[PDB]
Amino acid sequence: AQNPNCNIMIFHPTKEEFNDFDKYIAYMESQGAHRAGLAKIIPPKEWKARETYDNISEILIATPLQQVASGRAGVFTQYHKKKKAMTVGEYRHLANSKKYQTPPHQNFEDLERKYWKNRIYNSPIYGADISGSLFDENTKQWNLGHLGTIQDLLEKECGVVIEGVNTPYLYFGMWKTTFAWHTEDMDLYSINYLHLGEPKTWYVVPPEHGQRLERLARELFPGSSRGCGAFLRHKVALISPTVLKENGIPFNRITQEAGEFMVTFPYGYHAGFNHGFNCAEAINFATPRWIDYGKMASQCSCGEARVTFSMDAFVRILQPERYDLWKRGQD
């Protein structure tokens, strides 16, 4: 078995190997990359996502979210408070202000310590889930706006044509902006490109050990657990690496820098934080190996997790028994 310790693997494809996305994902998995739940892909040196980032300031962040924490430093939840619209230019100015900017630090490890020590005492503002793309339409390789769609993958594997579309999303982050512990909708893959700015640190649990994370989470967030059998779908719970180590949860960590891709694999729980002002683009995708994860994915039916138009069809076809109860939560 390849990668039996489930380490995060880093890949350095050539420009030739960067031509066929599907085939490269399949190559990574042949080397055991999926076992970690997350891989890093450094693009060939000849590759670029677009020519410059000089003209992005007029993108609108219609609903910036202030991330308010409750709990203790190592075990907390966050809620998202809606703020007034601002432009990327305005957001970047806010991210760089004395109130929100990254503090002095020695190295990524010192900054990670400061994050976990201090995150709960601040409320950073996140421009998340903004439909759109920063890839130049003439970038042909690993252009997240030109990937094959999940609906076409389901049609190719299973023979059923379904409604729905699949498009990318932009994330504008600042120091301490946080992504809570989650797997993707319907335990899909995700791919994330860090277009510009400061780094993003990631934590991940190997898919084969996901249930151990879930069990710890039910212990650490007992009222949430009673309210919903899949409450990590709410994307509100954080658990520090210290707390995971104390409870014997296997995980790994890695820092993504501007110009690098990350791929999360089906049922790979992940969480993390941004180091300072940055802009990432991400999209879900599927392969033939996803299908069986899609069939088994947990669902939130308490009604909190409230998800896309396109997830309907996935649940309808892959999880017909759940469909009924899940759509009652969605309506």
Ligand X SMILES: O=C(O)CNC(=O)C(=O)O
Nearer to ligand X, 182 or 212 (CB): 182
310 is in the binding site of which of ligand X, Zn ion, Ni ion, none (Cβ under 5 to 8 A by kind)?
none
46 binds Mg ion (CB under 5 A): no
Residue carrying structure tokens 């309808």: 316
Task: Report the site for Ni ion in 162-221 (rule: CB under 5 A).
Answer: 190
256 binds ligand X (CB under 6 A): no
Residue 201 identity (one-letter amino acid):
T
Binding residues for ligand X, how many (CB under 6 A)? 8
171 binds ligand X (CB under 6 A): yes
Nearer to ligand X, 171 or 267 (CB): 171
Q: Which residues contact 30 (CB under 8 A, 6 or more apart)?
A: 2
280 binds ligand X (CB under 6 A): yes
Nearer to ligand X, 29 or 185 (CB): 185
Nearer to ligand X, 69 or 282 (CB): 282
273 binds ligand X (CB under 6 A): no
Q: How far is the CB of 136 from ligand X (least distance, A)?
A: 21
190 binds ligand X (CB under 6 A): yes
Q: For helices 311-318 and 320-330, give the axis angle rounded to 10 degrees.
A: 150
Residue 102 identity (one-letter amino acid):
T
Which residue among 16, 58, 321, 331 contacts Mg ion (CB under 5 A)?
A: 58
How would you label 300-327 residue by residue, b for 16+ Cβ within 10 Å and e otherwise?
A: bbeebbebeebbbbbbbebbeebeeebe
Nearest CA among 41, 30, 40 for reference residue 1: 30
Nearest CA among 322, 69, 254, 250 for reference residue 176: 69
Quote the tokens at residue 54: 């000089």
Nearer to Mg ion, 56 or 120 (CB): 56
Which residue among 24, 91, 179, 293 contacts ligand X (CB under 6 A)?
A: 179
Asked if 204 and 259 count as a contact pair (C-beta separation under 8 A), the reply is no
58 is in the binding site of which of Zn ion, Mg ion, Ni ion, none (Cβ under 5 to 8 A by kind)?
Mg ion
Residue 281 identity (one-letter amino acid):
E
Rule CB under 6 A: which residues touch ligand X?
171, 179, 190, 192, 264, 270, 280, 282
